[PDB]
Enzyme design. Structure first.
Site, PDB file in Angstrom:
ATOM      1  N   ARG A   1     -16.445   5.631  27.090  1.00 39.74           N
ATOM      2  CA  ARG A   1     -16.796   7.046  27.107  1.00 39.74           C
ATOM      3  C   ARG A   1     -18.311   7.194  27.016  1.00 39.74           C
ATOM      4  O   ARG A   1     -19.002   6.269  26.597  1.00 39.74           O
ATOM      5  CB  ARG A   1     -16.093   7.809  25.973  1.00 39.74           C
ATOM      6  CG  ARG A   1     -16.051   7.078  24.631  1.00 39.74           C
ATOM      7  CD  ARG A   1     -15.418   7.940  23.541  1.00 39.74           C
ATOM      8  NE  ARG A   1     -14.972   7.144  22.398  1.00 39.74           N
ATOM      9  CZ  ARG A   1     -14.740   7.635  21.184  1.00 39.74           C
ATOM     10  NH1 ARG A   1     -14.919   8.928  20.944  1.00 39.74           N
ATOM     11  NH2 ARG A   1     -14.332   6.835  20.205  1.00 39.74           N
TER      12      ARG A   1
ATOM     13  N   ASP B   1      -9.204 -12.869  21.469  1.00 34.61           N
ATOM     14  CA  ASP B   1      -7.846 -12.419  21.218  1.00 34.61           C
ATOM     15  C   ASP B   1      -7.107 -12.293  22.547  1.00 34.61           C
ATOM     16  O   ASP B   1      -7.724 -12.284  23.613  1.00 34.61           O
ATOM     17  CB  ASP B   1      -7.848 -11.098  20.443  1.00 34.61           C
ATOM     18  CG  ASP B   1      -8.495  -9.964  21.218  1.00 34.61           C
ATOM     19  OD1 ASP B   1      -7.965  -9.598  22.283  1.00 34.61           O
ATOM     20  OD2 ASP B   1      -9.523  -9.429  20.757  1.00 34.61           O
TER      21      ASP B   1
ATOM     22  N   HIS C   1      -7.924  -9.070  24.938  1.00 34.59           N
ATOM     23  CA  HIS C   1      -9.139  -9.133  25.739  1.00 34.59           C
ATOM     24  C   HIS C   1      -9.092 -10.248  26.775  1.00 34.59           C
ATOM     25  O   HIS C   1      -9.785 -10.193  27.789  1.00 34.59           O
ATOM     26  CB  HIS C   1     -10.376  -9.268  24.850  1.00 34.59           C
ATOM     27  CG  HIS C   1     -10.755  -7.998  24.161  1.00 34.59           C
ATOM     28  ND1 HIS C   1     -10.294  -7.668  22.904  1.00 34.59           N
ATOM     29  CD2 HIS C   1     -11.528  -6.962  24.562  1.00 34.59           C
ATOM     30  CE1 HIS C   1     -10.778  -6.489  22.556  1.00 34.59           C
ATOM     31  NE2 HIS C   1     -11.530  -6.040  23.545  1.00 34.59           N
TER      32      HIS C   1
ATOM     33  N   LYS D   1     -21.240   5.631  24.313  1.00 29.50           N
ATOM     34  CA  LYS D   1     -20.726   4.570  23.434  1.00 29.50           C
ATOM     35  C   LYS D   1     -20.992   3.170  24.018  1.00 29.50           C
ATOM     36  O   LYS D   1     -21.749   3.024  24.979  1.00 29.50           O
ATOM     37  CB  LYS D   1     -19.247   4.779  23.082  1.00 29.50           C
ATOM     38  CG  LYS D   1     -18.974   6.066  22.288  1.00 29.50           C
ATOM     39  CD  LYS D   1     -17.806   5.921  21.314  1.00 29.50           C
ATOM     40  CE  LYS D   1     -18.210   5.083  20.103  1.00 29.50           C
ATOM     41  NZ  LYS D   1     -17.058   4.770  19.207  1.00 29.50           N
TER      42      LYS D   1
ATOM     43  N   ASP E   1     -17.632  -2.809  26.564  1.00 34.26           N
ATOM     44  CA  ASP E   1     -16.501  -3.588  26.064  1.00 34.26           C
ATOM     45  C   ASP E   1     -15.754  -4.236  27.231  1.00 34.26           C
ATOM     46  O   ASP E   1     -15.386  -3.567  28.196  1.00 34.26           O
ATOM     47  CB  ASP E   1     -15.555  -2.696  25.256  1.00 34.26           C
ATOM     48  CG  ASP E   1     -14.330  -3.445  24.721  1.00 34.26           C
ATOM     49  OD1 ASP E   1     -14.009  -4.554  25.202  1.00 34.26           O
ATOM     50  OD2 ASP E   1     -13.668  -2.911  23.809  1.00 34.26           O
TER      51      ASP E   1
ATOM     52  N   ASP F   1     -14.339  -8.985  23.579  1.00 28.07           N
ATOM     53  CA  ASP F   1     -14.961  -7.668  23.703  1.00 28.07           C
ATOM     54  C   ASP F   1     -16.427  -7.769  24.132  1.00 28.07           C
ATOM     55  O   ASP F   1     -16.782  -7.375  25.239  1.00 28.07           O
ATOM     56  CB  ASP F   1     -14.810  -6.939  22.356  1.00 28.07           C
ATOM     57  CG  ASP F   1     -15.570  -5.619  22.279  1.00 28.07           C
ATOM     58  OD1 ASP F   1     -16.465  -5.350  23.107  1.00 28.07           O
ATOM     59  OD2 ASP F   1     -15.272  -4.844  21.347  1.00 28.07           O
TER      60      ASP F   1
ATOM     61  N   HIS G   1     -11.689   9.657  28.271  1.00 28.44           N
ATOM     62  CA  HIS G   1     -11.702   8.241  27.890  1.00 28.44           C
ATOM     63  C   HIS G   1     -11.064   7.347  28.949  1.00 28.44           C
ATOM     64  O   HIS G   1     -10.021   7.680  29.512  1.00 28.44           O
ATOM     65  CB  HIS G   1     -10.982   8.034  26.552  1.00 28.44           C
ATOM     66  CG  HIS G   1     -11.313   6.736  25.879  1.00 28.44           C
ATOM     67  ND1 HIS G   1     -10.766   5.532  26.269  1.00 28.44           N
ATOM     68  CD2 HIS G   1     -12.139   6.456  24.844  1.00 28.44           C
ATOM     69  CE1 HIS G   1     -11.241   4.567  25.502  1.00 28.44           C
ATOM     70  NE2 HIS G   1     -12.078   5.100  24.631  1.00 28.44           N
TER      71      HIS G   1
ATOM     72  N   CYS H   1     -12.722  -5.121  27.799  1.00 26.99           N
ATOM     73  CA  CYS H   1     -11.401  -4.648  28.228  1.00 26.99           C
ATOM     74  C   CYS H   1     -11.490  -3.508  29.244  1.00 26.99           C
ATOM     75  O   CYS H   1     -10.578  -3.310  30.042  1.00 26.99           O
ATOM     76  CB  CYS H   1     -10.503  -4.267  27.040  1.00 26.99           C
ATOM     77  SG  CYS H   1     -11.080  -2.898  26.011  1.00 26.99           S
ATOM     78  N   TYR H   2     -12.592  -2.768  29.224  1.00 26.27           N
ATOM     79  CA  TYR H   2     -12.773  -1.679  30.176  1.00 26.27           C
ATOM     80  C   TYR H   2     -13.036  -2.206  31.583  1.00 26.27           C
ATOM     81  O   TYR H   2     -13.037  -1.445  32.549  1.00 26.27           O
ATOM     82  CB  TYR H   2     -13.889  -0.736  29.727  1.00 26.27           C
ATOM     83  CG  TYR H   2     -13.591  -0.045  28.417  1.00 26.27           C
ATOM     84  CD1 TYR H   2     -14.515  -0.043  27.380  1.00 26.27           C
ATOM     85  CD2 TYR H   2     -12.374   0.590  28.211  1.00 26.27           C
ATOM     86  CE1 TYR H   2     -14.237   0.584  26.177  1.00 26.27           C
ATOM     87  CE2 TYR H   2     -12.087   1.218  27.018  1.00 26.27           C
ATOM     88  CZ  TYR H   2     -13.021   1.213  26.003  1.00 26.27           C
ATOM     89  OH  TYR H   2     -12.733   1.839  24.815  1.00 26.27           O
TER      90      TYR H   2
END
Ligand SMILES: Cn1cnc(S(=O)(=O)N(CCN(Cc2cncn2C)c2ccc(C#N)cc2)Cc2ccccc2)c1
Ligand SMILES: CC(C)=CCC/C(C)=C/CC/C(C)=C/COP(=O)(O)OP(=O)(O)O
Ligand SMILES: [Zn+2]
EC number: 2.5.1.58
Lengths: 407, 323
Positions: free
Chosen positions: A275, A343, A346, A278, A281, A336, A232, A283-284
């Site tokens: 991962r 938020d 993020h 999936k 997003d 996201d 991850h 934040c990645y």
């Protein structure tokens, strides 16, 4: 040429990057297709509206959002009552990336609050009167370093901090997150991060830690939370970053790791997933993409001659496009993915990832890529600590003036 | 007793049986930062929790209060710690607490604290007899829940419950062959039982994977698994692999198949194979196709590979500068 679309996501070839499900439908493909459809609309909106695209980072809007949050939050954040130093960190770092100064009254008020969060026996808690915990401890230290004043530095009780770290250390090389708590790779990172910045690293503090982290790398190339778990992006960042701090990157198979992370960028969306199989997003944009500056530095230290001298080993253009077009809330703050709510978490990491994608640097070589208007350019960030590179140097130097507790 | 969502729920400051205790307001300082505007319910419950924590009151009423504090914010690890103190101190029935924790996980399955709490309970009782079935239920609602899979690995490993997991893996692969969590669990089970050195086992695993790849050529999980189980010994150790992949080019092509080919050539060049130069150019040809057409998102990666192969496998690689 006039027919040439300057934006990578909007070119006609891009349509070929859509999911091919081989006419075999499963929950995974169905959910992936939903996301791609939503992202396609965002890309096509300019064409259907008959307007020429303009990628603008809504600085003013984001600033208002942060400025207020730094003082007051709605009850929507009750679920984060045990992570208030994180909120301090996310907001300050966001302002820092946006190049907004921190009023000295704010700085002093932040310092005082974190003092109340500090435990008598070392470490920081999620709020005043809460037990210490390595995650909020990491967040607190980072926030004080961003502020960087003598007042900020003095908040941290270094003797107790080291004692706290020791009480968490396990015989097999790992750390608990907190007393009576759980173990995973994040705790190693949190520990290595605060210990290096404050100069409290003893000869035996991290005995066996690099080896335990190395046991977390799996058949995929990436790193899992504990030995045996799926790889991850969050745990992989923590692992490599900790190893870099400990100067043990070589304990990992850097080659399989590099192949794993680069594969995590989505061909259609342009952003990163956490991962295999999936969803993308925002934040990645940091946890995943942040690995590439780390690998570059590591591979280069091994004298790798094939390393590019102007770009990271991921699509910098496509990531910026994803963040700028899909991850901004019109009223300020980032998020996201389209359809999700804004938020401060993020907001912090979308901007962090944006900076990574704008700025390349390797010793003497320096090269920037800024998509959209030039005002989009942000302040750079350090790939290990995720604070300003200057704040890192400043902090480390200052604490080197002190001797490691116990001498 | 009195549920937090009950229509007849009453604030603690209005409860007779709590009349003796003074609540303890949060100390945020004279000029707060990141201050949260708590609701009445929230601030009331936590003002009273601070009181009992401070007094270290280990009573039945404090025990019940922790349930409400957890309900308001299940991520509050300090409350969880106190609750475990009360469990031991009051000699509470642990199966009753098991009943409680399973309900909380059902409704908030993506929370660190709740899973750790379940683990401590299982440790205390030394009883894993409910675990695999409970976890299966969570995975039935979200087949990729990270905490769920982690708990499953811990339980199986600590209590040696290996005998039925492969069957479970096969079942989930049927429902969704794209589930990377399940491919990870498959590797996890085999590694800790027979291992991959047993030729019969390795043989079985590769056939199955290639199968699945044939059924769903664009499913990346299968590709990564196949690569993962062959890469330690070395891809070039398996000479039939190359031709068999090339034989899927026609009607099973993908950027994944192309990438694998490059990995085979790479290893071949490392173990000094025949036709050193012929193999090199084949690889650079593919590295270009990927970077320019077939997988441009990774153009920077593929250019790096092609550049690396040149740097160390060109016929001029070992030739001195003077020659
Ligand atoms: C699911 N997940 C993805 N990343 C993580 S995490 O880094 O370990 N993290 C995620 C928690 N998390 C959920 C999340 C993140 N990205 C997507 N999600 C759903 C989250 C935490 C804080 C905010 C705010 N404001 C918003 C979302 C944990 C966490 C919680 C509090 C403080 C710090 C980290 C979890
Ligand atoms: C220092 C520190 C605290 C770092 C944080 C590291 C980090 C991002 C960890 C994430 C772990 C996790 C539970 C992922 C899965 O969530 P998910 O299944 O909801 O998301 P996913 O579907 O994208 O994997
Ligand atoms: Zn996220």
């Amino acid at each position: 040429p006039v027919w040439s679309e300057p934006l990578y996501s909007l070119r006609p070839e891009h349509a070929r990057e859509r999911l091919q499900d081989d006419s075999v439908e499963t929950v995974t493909s169905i959910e992936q297709a939903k996301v791609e459809e939503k992202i396609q609309e965002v890309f096509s909106s300019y064409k259907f509206n008959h307007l020429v695209p303009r990628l603008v980072l809504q600085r003013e809007k984001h600033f208002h959002y942060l400025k207020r949050g730094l003082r007051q939050l709605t009850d929507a954040y009750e679920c984060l009552d045990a992570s208030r130093p994180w909120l301090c960190y996310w907001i300050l770092h966001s302002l820092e990336l946006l190049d907004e100064p921190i009023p000295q009254i704010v700085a002093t008020d932040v310092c005082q609050f974190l003092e109340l969060c500090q435990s008598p026996d070392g470490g920081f808690g999620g709020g005043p009167g809460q037990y210490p915990h390595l995650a909020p401890t990491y967040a607190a230290v980072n926030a004080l370093c961003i502020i960087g004043t003598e007042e900020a530095y003095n908040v941290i009780n270094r003797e107790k901090l080291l004692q706290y770290l020791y009480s968490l250390k396990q015989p097999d090389g790992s750390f608990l997150m907190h007393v009576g708590g759980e173990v995973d790779v994040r705790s190693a990172y949190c520990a290595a991060s605060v210990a290096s910045l404050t100069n409290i690293i003893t000869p035996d503090l991290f005995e066996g830690t690099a080896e335990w982290i190395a046991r977390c790398q799996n058949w995929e190339g990436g790193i899992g939370g504990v030995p045996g778990m799926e790889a991850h992006g969050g745990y992989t960042f923590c692992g490599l970053a900790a190893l870099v701090i400990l100067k043990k990157e070589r304990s990992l198979n850097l080659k399989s790791l590099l192949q794993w992370v680069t594969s995590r960028q989505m061909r259609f969306e342009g952003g990163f997933q956490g991962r295999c199989n999936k969803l993308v997003d925002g934040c990645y944009s940091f946890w995943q993409a942040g690995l590439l500056p780390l690998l570059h530095r590591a591979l280069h230290a091994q004298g790798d001659p094939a390393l590019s001298m102007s770009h990271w080993m991921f699509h910098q253009q496509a990531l910026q496009e994803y963040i700028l077009m899909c991850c901004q809330c019109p009223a300020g703050g980032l998020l996201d993915k389209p359809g999700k709510s804004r938020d401060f978490y993020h907001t912090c990491y979308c901007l962090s990832g944006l900076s990574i994608a704008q700025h390349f640097g390797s010793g003497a070589m320096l090269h920037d890529v800024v998509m959209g208007v030039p005002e989009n350019v942000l302040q750079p960030t350090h790939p290990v600590y995720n604070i300003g590179p200057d704040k890192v140097i400043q902090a480390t130097t200052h604490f080197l003036q002190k001797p490691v507790p116990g001498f | 007793f009195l549920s937090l969502d009950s229509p007849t729920y009453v604030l603690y400051r209005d409860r007779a049986e709590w009349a003796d205790i003074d609540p303890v307001p949060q100390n945020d300082g004279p000029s707060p930062v990141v201050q949260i505007i708590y609701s009445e319910k929230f601030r009331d419950v936590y003002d009273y929790f601070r009181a009992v924590l401070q007094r270290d009151e280990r009573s039945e009423r404090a025990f019940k209060l922790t349930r409400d504090a957890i309900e308001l914010n299940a991520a509050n690890y300090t409350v969880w710690h106190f609750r475990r103190v009360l469990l031991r101190s009051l000699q509470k029935d642990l199966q009753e607490e098991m009943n409680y924790i399973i309900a909380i996980i059902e409704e908030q399955p993506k929370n660190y604290q709740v899973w750790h709490h379940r683990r401590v309970l299982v440790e205390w009782l030394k009883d894993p007899s409910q675990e695999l079935e409970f976890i299966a239920d969570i995975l039935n609602q979200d087949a990729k829940n990270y905490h769920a899979w982690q708990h499953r690995q811990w339980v199986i490993q600590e209590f040696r419950l290996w005998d039925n997991e492969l069957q479970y893996v096969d079942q989930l692969l049927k429902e969704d062959v794209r589930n990377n969590s399940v491919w990870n669990q498959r590797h996890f089970v085999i590694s800790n039982t027979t291992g991959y050195s047993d030729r019969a086992v390795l043989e079985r695993e590769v056939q199955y994977t290639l199968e699945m790849i044939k059924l769903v050529p664009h499913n990346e999980s299968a590709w990564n698994y196949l690569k993962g189980i062959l890469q330690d010994r070395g891809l070039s150790r398996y000479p039939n692999l190359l031709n068999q992949l090339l034989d899927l080019q026609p009607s099973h092509s993908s950027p994944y198949l192309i990438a694998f080919l490059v990995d085979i050539y790479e290893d071949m060049l490392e173990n000094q194979c025949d036709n050193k130069e012929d193999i090199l150019n084949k690889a650079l040809e593919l590295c270009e196709i990927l970077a320019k057409e077939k997988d441009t998102i990774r153009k920077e990666y593929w250019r790096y590979i092609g550049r690396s192969l040149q740097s160390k496998h060109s016929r001029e690689s070992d030739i001195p500068a003077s020659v």
